[PDB]
Amino acid sequence: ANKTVVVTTILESPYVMMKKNHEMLEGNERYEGYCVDLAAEIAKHCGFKYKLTIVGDGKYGARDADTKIWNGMVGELVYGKADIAIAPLTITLVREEVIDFSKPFMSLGISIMIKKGTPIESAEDLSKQTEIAYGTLDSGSTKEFFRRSKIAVFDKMWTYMRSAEPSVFVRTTAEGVARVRKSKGKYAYLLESTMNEYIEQRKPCDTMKVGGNLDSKGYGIATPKGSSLGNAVNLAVLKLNEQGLLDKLKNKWWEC
Amino acid sequence: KTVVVTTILESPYVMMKKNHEMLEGNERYEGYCVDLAAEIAKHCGFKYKLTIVGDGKYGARDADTKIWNGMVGELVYGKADIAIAPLTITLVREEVIDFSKPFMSLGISIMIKKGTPIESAEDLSKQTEIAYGTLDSGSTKEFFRRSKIAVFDKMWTYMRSAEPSVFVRTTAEGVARVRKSKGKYAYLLESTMNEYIEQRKPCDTMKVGGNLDSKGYGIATPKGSSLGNAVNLAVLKLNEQGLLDKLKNKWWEC
């Protein structure tokens, strides 16, 4: 690279977190987490300096159907605000058409979060009932998945979600988790298995993952199309995996 | 023109059809990869011819000369246009060819004959009574040669100095070596084949311990190929539509 690399990411524990004493720290030293360590290791094996930045709008990435404008970390790569995205960013077909992804460094699938005691076990259960509302993050891969799915059960769920009143969408993942906890079992949150399981095993220990994953995908490091950094970043990811660092980082950062 | 697809004869990925001697062309073969090639050829809009890799190898290179063999070599040296097989995505392979995003996941595991006193990779590295090795021309050999983890590096130090040779030249040779060694050989292979062989007679093998790593199979094309981008989007499409899970269930006793 010829400049200091601008890395965009999102504040999502345990991937990126503010240090207890971040107010006294400068630059990259303010943050900590799985993706903070991963960026240092990618930058080390690619030979560039980098500055960690938090995505301005706090979004993963969605595409406006009318204007085709992207937002979130995806938009920051498409419109030249960032050089690389190191975050739990899901590899998707639609995103792969405007940005480049490295090979996945972590796997996941869409899963269901419920409040302990809710009579729900699968997405089939959710689509066949009207007592428990459900929704997902509005600006992420999960919304994209349901919007595009030709699969009957998932299309039926999408049709219900976008027509529900009050809205069942949430604009952050934390909003979704909180909605489950305060809805007395009347709201089920559709989110990725990684965060679902993470929340499950932590206080107040009142949420739970039910059913199996709805699909199988992974997180990847993203760069803009044509960037002379994607090839290097891709090899770095594969080297860190083959050397065993990704397993070490997983164990490092991963109660009820 | 017609795209030359290189693959390898491994069940249930690629197999000979019943009465294959009387069939011609692509109709001689069937399996997960045979169905997968048709789907990718459909979404990418090209005609293709299935061919089995000449040397029956997955792909390794000489450390000094950097010359490749196996399916990787057929792509690097212009003998095939695309590889559709259980070919593992690795660092060294991605330096000379391109891979799509993984269409299937797997890890390195340990195969033993039933009754062998082994449960993990650490157990093997702590002794020599029970020999252990892996395929010589594959990604598992690359893993043990390039792994920075201590226990794996000790297994590599043992393998390349053991006597008689613990390496094998085909996966069938490794499995046969476990079944014939009366419990004195452990074969390091990928979990997909380990668990598949486990549920097939003679039913005298089993998988012990968790996977030593986590990786995936990807569709390979030579660098600069005009099929690369399209093939990658096809895999992601087939995954989104659930067809990869359909093929798995379709093609996947003790």
Ligand SMILES: [NH3+][C@@H](Cc1c(-c2nnn(Cc3cccc(Cl)c3)n2)o[nH]c1=O)C(=O)O
């Ligand atoms: N990853 C999706 C976003 C996304 C998620 C999601 N779930 N978990 N993450 C990351 C995460 C946060 C906190 C803790 C842990 Cl363990 C993992 N993203 O769920 N629906 C979506 O749409 C995207 O790229 O749009």
Ligand SMILES: [NH3+][C@@H](Cc1c(-c2nnn(Cc3cccc(Cl)c3)n2)o[nH]c1=O)C(=O)O
């Ligand atoms: N995949 C590796 C080869 C490779 C394998 C391996 N194991 N299983 N396969 C594919 C397979 C065969 C038979 C049945 C089933 Cl289910 C799966 N390849 O083990 N060590 C290696 O080095 C490579 O690309 O080099």
Ligand SMILES: [Cl-]
């Ligand atoms: Cl993982």
Ligand SMILES: [Cl-]
């Ligand atoms: Cl359906």
Ligand SMILES: [Cl-]
């Ligand atoms: Cl021709």
Ligand SMILES: [Cl-]
């Ligand atoms: Cl899989």
Ligand SMILES: [Cl-]
């Ligand atoms: Cl170690």
